[PDB]
Amino acid sequence: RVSSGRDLNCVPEIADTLGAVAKQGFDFLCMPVFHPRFKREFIQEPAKNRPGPQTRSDLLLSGRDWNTLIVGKLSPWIRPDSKVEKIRRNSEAAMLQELNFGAYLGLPAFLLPLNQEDNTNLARVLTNHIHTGHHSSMFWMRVPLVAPEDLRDDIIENAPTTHTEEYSGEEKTWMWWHNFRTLCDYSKRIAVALEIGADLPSNHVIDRWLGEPIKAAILPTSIFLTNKKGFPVLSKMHQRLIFRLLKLEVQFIITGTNHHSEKEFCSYLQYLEYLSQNRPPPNAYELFAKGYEDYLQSPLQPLMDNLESQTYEVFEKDPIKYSQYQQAIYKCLLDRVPEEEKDTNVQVLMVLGAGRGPLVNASLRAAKQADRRIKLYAVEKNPNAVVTLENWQFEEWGSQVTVVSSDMREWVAPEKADIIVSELLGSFADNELSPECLDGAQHFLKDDGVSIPGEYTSFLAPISSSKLYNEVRACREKDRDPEAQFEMPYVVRLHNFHQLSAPQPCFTFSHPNRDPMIDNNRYCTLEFPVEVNTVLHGFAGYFETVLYQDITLSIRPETHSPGMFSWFPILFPIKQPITVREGQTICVRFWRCSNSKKVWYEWAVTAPVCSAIHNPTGRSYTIGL
Amino acid sequence: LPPNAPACMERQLEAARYRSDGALLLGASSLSGRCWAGSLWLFKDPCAAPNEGFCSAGVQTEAGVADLTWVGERGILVASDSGAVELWELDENETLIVSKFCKYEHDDIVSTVSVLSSGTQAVSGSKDICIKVWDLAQQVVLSSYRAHAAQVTCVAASPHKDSVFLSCSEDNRILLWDTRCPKPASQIGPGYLPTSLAWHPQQSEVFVFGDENGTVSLVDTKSVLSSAVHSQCVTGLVFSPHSVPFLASLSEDCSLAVLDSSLSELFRSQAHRDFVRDATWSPLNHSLLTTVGWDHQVVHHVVPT
Numbered sequence: 001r002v003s004s005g006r007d008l009n010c011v012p013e014i015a016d017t018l019g020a021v022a023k024q025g026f027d028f029l030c031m032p033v034f035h036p037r038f039k040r041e042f043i044q045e046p047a048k049n050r051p052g053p054q055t056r057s058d059l060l061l062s063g064r065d066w067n068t069l070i071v072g073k074l075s076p077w078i079r080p081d082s083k084v085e086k087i088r089r090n091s092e093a094a095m096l097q098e099l100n101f102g103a104y105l106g107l108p109a110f111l112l113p114l115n116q117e118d119n120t121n122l123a124r125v126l127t128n129h130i131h132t133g134h135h136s137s138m139f140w141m142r143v144p145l146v147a148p149e150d151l152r153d154d155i156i157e158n159a160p161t162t163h164t165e166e167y168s169g170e171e172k173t174w175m176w177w178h179n180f181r182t183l184c185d186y187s188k189r190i191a192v193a194l195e196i197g198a199d200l201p202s203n204h205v206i207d208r209w210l211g212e213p214i215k216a217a218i219l220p221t222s223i224f225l226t227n228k229k230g231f232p233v234l235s236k237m238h239q240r241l242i243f244r245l246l247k248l249e250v251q252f253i254i255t256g257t258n259h260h261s262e263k264e265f266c267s268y269l270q271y272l273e274y275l276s277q278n279r280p281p282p283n284a285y286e287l288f289a290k291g292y293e294d295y296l297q298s299p300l301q302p303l304m305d306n307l308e309s310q311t312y313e314v315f316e317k318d319p320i321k322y323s324q325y326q327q328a329i330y331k332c333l334l335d336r337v338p339e340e341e342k343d344t345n346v347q348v349l350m351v352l353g354a355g356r357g358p359l360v361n362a363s364l365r366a367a368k369q370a371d372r373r374i375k376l377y378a379v380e381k382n383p384n385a386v387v388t389l390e391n392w393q394f395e396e397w398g399s400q401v402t403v404v405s406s407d408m409r410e411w412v413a414p415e416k417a418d419i420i421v422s423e424l425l426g427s428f429a430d431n432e433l434s435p436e437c438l439d440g441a442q443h444f445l446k447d448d449g450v451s452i453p454g455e456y457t458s459f460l461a462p463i464s465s466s467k468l469y470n471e472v473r474a475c476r477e478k479d480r481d482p483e484a485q486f487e488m489p490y491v492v493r494l495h496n497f498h499q500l501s502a503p504q505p506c507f508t509f510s511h512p513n514r515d516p517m518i519d520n521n522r523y524c525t526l527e528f529p530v531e532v533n534t535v536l537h538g539f540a541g542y543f544e545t546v547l548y549q550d551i552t553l554s555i556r557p558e559t560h561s562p563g564m565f566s567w568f569p570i571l572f573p574i575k576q577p578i579t580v581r582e583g584q585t586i587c588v589r590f591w592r593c594s595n596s597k598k599v600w601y602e603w604a605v606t607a608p609v610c611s612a613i614h615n616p617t618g619r620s621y622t623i624g625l
Numbered sequence: 626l627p628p629n630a631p632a633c634m635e636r637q638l639e640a641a642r643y644r645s646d647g648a649l650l651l652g653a654s655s656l657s658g659r660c661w662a663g664s665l666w667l668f669k670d671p672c673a674a675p676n677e678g679f680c681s682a683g684v685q686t687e688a689g690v691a692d693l694t695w696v697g698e699r700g701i702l703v704a705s706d707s708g709a710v711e712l713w714e715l716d717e718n719e720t721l722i723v724s725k726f727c728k729y730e731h732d733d734i735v736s737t738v739s740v741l742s743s744g745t746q747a748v749s750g751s752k753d754i755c756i757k758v759w760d761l762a763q764q765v766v767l768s769s770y771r772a773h774a775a776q777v778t779c780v781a782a783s784p785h786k787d788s789v790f791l792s793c794s795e796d797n798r799i800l801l802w803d804t805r806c807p808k809p810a811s812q813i814g815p816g817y818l819p820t821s822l823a824w825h826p827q828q829s830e831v832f833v834f835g836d837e838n839g840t841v842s843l844v845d846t847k848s849v850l851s852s853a854v855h856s857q858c859v860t861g862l863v864f865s866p867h868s869v870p871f872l873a874s875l876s877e878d879c880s881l882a883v884l885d886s887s888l889s890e891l892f893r894s895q896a897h898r899d900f901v902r903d904a905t906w907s908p909l910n911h912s913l914l915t916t917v918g919w920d921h922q923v924v925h926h927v928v929p930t
């Protein structure tokens with residue numbers, strides 16, 4: 001199912017028009033709330049005293065219909081940025097009048113054009129309207145992929161069209177939108193209605209709108225091609241853009257008259273439905289991760305906090321993750337116990353942080369298929385999960401598994417371990433203090449003991465996403481620093497965003513750590529080449545870990561463990577967006593800081609522009625030891 | 626009260642044109658209220674308009690009338706809000722106004738329309754930034770040009786060159802067209818947006834244009850004279866049928882003005898209380914001038930020659 005609307009600039013009768021639009025298959029209708037030719041004076045007489053009514057009556061539709069079926073449109077004659085002063089004054093009052101009438105109707109959306117570079121006064125009037133009451137109405141800024149002047153026909157003899165490429169000039173429409181929303185202070189109610197043209201611009205121009213709050217895509221009937229049976233279709237390049245937009249789940253809008261007069265008008269809409277049915281269904285991961293797109297979550301701190309029951313259930317609904325663990329345990333048992341010692345050598349396996357025991361079962365299945373004997377310890381400090389482990393141990397595992405309700409840093413093991421297994425990793429690898437926990441458990445690991453995982457590495461990548469910046473921005477709380485939300489990471493299924501560079505390794509830890517002077521503090525400087533123009537809002541974080549030899553877990557996209565639902569990426573924001581030109585290098589600095597009580601991250605951008613140092617002294621975010 | 630003629634005429638009178646014998650053609654739009662549509666009217670008695678009960682013929686259109694013009698003596702070409710250009714024709718008895726064709730080719734409101742010299746073709750402009758040349762006989766579009774970058778405000782055909790016509794848009798361009806050239810458009814040179822165009826009737830290379838600021842200018846193809854006639858946008862410019870013709874200018878300041886050859890003011894009428902939309906000179910009495918506006922008034926001015 002595709003949510004689509006019909007754009008019209010001519011509505012004789014609302015009841016008749018809306019009924020025809022609905023019977024064609026549309027969900028909503030874009031129409032003007034005043035007559036687009038009904039120019040109205042506000043200052044000079046006698047035109048200002050024109051008798052009413054000024055427009056249609058609100059009684060012509062039910063309140064439910066205005067709330068869900070109608071999208072308002074600003075009148076075309078309203079030019080708040082006209083160079084003529086009288087035209088500005090009348091446009092300012094008319095824009096307030098039309099906007100206020102839409103809010104009066106409870107309309108869910110209002111369309112406003114971005115058809116030129118200077119919309120400064122248009123932004124001021126809209127910003128004034130946004131701060132005049134408490135409303136949730138959306139404002140769709142109608143902006144084209146290609147400016148009209150850049151797509152006009154080369155039919156003016158003394159004013160030809162330029163043929164040389166203008167890499168930045170071809171991106172002028174994004175600058176129109178960027179400056180407008182920047183003047184409007186990134187208002188959550190201001191979104192983009194991207195208008196698709198007949199000739200798509202170069203991919204970089206289309207990639208500009210990655211991460212932008214696109215809520216609607218406008219497809220003129222003029223761009224639809226014609227097949228053999230006379231039905232409107234799209235070029236393969238247009239189809240490519242439609243599929244990317246279907247992932248953003250934008251609402252499509254059909255504008256223009258019927259240019260395929262033989263076929264009925266619902267032929268355009270049926271083709272959008274056709275393209276939508278012809279795409280791969282949710283592939284396991286996308287079936288699990290749908291609903292969490294761009295949803296900010298506080299990173300779990302399973303050391304400082306005790307995880308709830310259903311949080312462990314989320315961990316356990318990923319068999320691919322634990323079959324990797326089982327395979328890592330399987331290979332390790334064979335490498336430590338030769339065949340002649342299969343019956344005499346019993347390996348001491350210790351699960352450090354067992355939760356409800358998925359690693360314990362994976363260890364048991366590993367020893368079975370490896371045909372080796374193991375003695376199992378299930379260490380877990382969360383006493384609520386220890387209840388799950390001990391009922392398991394009495395009913396199934398038996399004396400082979402020894403449940404230990406203790407912190408692995410304080411537990412006095414009765415013997416040393418051949419293999420320690422742990423799952424203490426977060427989205428940023430070490431952000432749950434897995435190094436600190438395994439360092440404290442290292443003493444009861446044998447001199448030749450194996451730690452699974454053996455090492456892990458965190459990756460960072462600069463991203464562009466005005467929506468995620470706004471989502472972070474909306475996390476201000478009453479009784480703390482007004483900017484604290486920008487100095488803490490978030491676990492989030494990154495969706496509407498643009499990754500500005502290939503991710504690069506940040507922090508790495510090895511276990512066991514034979515080094516005599518163990519220091520988990522880190523300081524890493526990264527330089528990210530950027531081959532586009534964009535606006536930096538934060539850095540995405542991933543991780544890779546080696547369970548054993550070649551068996552790995554990874555959420556790093558280029559090496560993402562195929563079919564693994566566990567772990568969304570992490571997001572480190574920055575207080576202020578940073579403009580980045582093509583060819584410039586984004587240089588970020590990251591510190592892993594710690595004391596006896598807390599561990600935290602600090603980060604700063606040093607190129608092309610310096611940011612403030614974020615989360616200094618962990619004032620806004622720490623990870624409890 | 627003719628047959629199939631609406632009992633009530635729309636308030637916003639948009640266009641008024643005389644034909645040879647002196648009958649008055651009227652175009653009206655409903656720019657407010659429940660229904661937004663239009664109508665066409667024929668008044669062989671100009672002093673009876675706008676009263677519907679004393680009209681010669683009338684008919685209703687599905688949408689508003691943004692602009693119209695005669696096509697000969699019985700043809701009526703209409704620019705509809707629906708994106709369609711419509712052609713209506715009077716029957717033999719001139720008591721009905723029947724629709725000839727209704728073709729939806731523009732993607733937005735059709736704002737301006739004009740008939741070329743031969744009377745067999747017409748050019749239209751619309752808010753969809755496009756300009757189309759029409760074959761009135763085949764009821765098809767011959768050419769669709771996209772030279773402008775904003776909405777087209779006005780298109781005016783050359784009086785005697787069937788391939789030449791003017792156009793102005795809110796992209797600040799005034800384009801001289803000639804379909805005989807491989808690139809038919811040619812720009813004529815910072816000022817304010819042009820809003821109205823009028824060829825000179827007795828000079829092939831001379832025309833006048835008004836801007837959004839109230840200035841009427843006199844232009845030749847190659848080397849300017851201008852006068853601030855209005856305090857608001859200049860809506861229309863119509864030359865009189867005299868040997869040395871006068872120039873009637875319209876504006877949203879609710880005022881009519883008549884200018885001589887040097888753009889100097891000779892007459893002034895503030896009889897209208899709303900916008901002044903069209904003006905047409907009587908062919909019978911060359912000194913009489915009729916204007917219409919959104920105040921529903923049809924004023925017959927006596928212009929002192």
Ligand SMILES: Cn1ncc(-c2ccc3c(=O)[nH]nc(CN)c3c2)c1-c1ccc2ccccc2c1C#N
Nearest residue numbers: 297298299300314315423424425426491566567568
């Ligand atoms: C918010 N957050 N921070 C870390 C985690 C997480 C997720 C998976 C694992 C895991 O699989 N193993 N281990 C750990 C910790 N060591 C682990 C930690 C979550 C989490 C919480 C509930 C969910 C519910 C639905 C969808 C996603 C999640 C996410 C996400 N991603």
Ligand SMILES: CSC[C@H]1O[C@@H](n2cnc3c(N)ncnc32)[C@H](O)[C@@H]1O
Nearest residue numbers: 302303353355380381382407408423
């Ligand atoms: C699988 S999520 C991490 C698991 O390890 C446990 N855990 C984390 N840190 C420690 C620790 N220091 N000692 C014991 N269990 C721990 C958590 O309580 C959870 O069950």
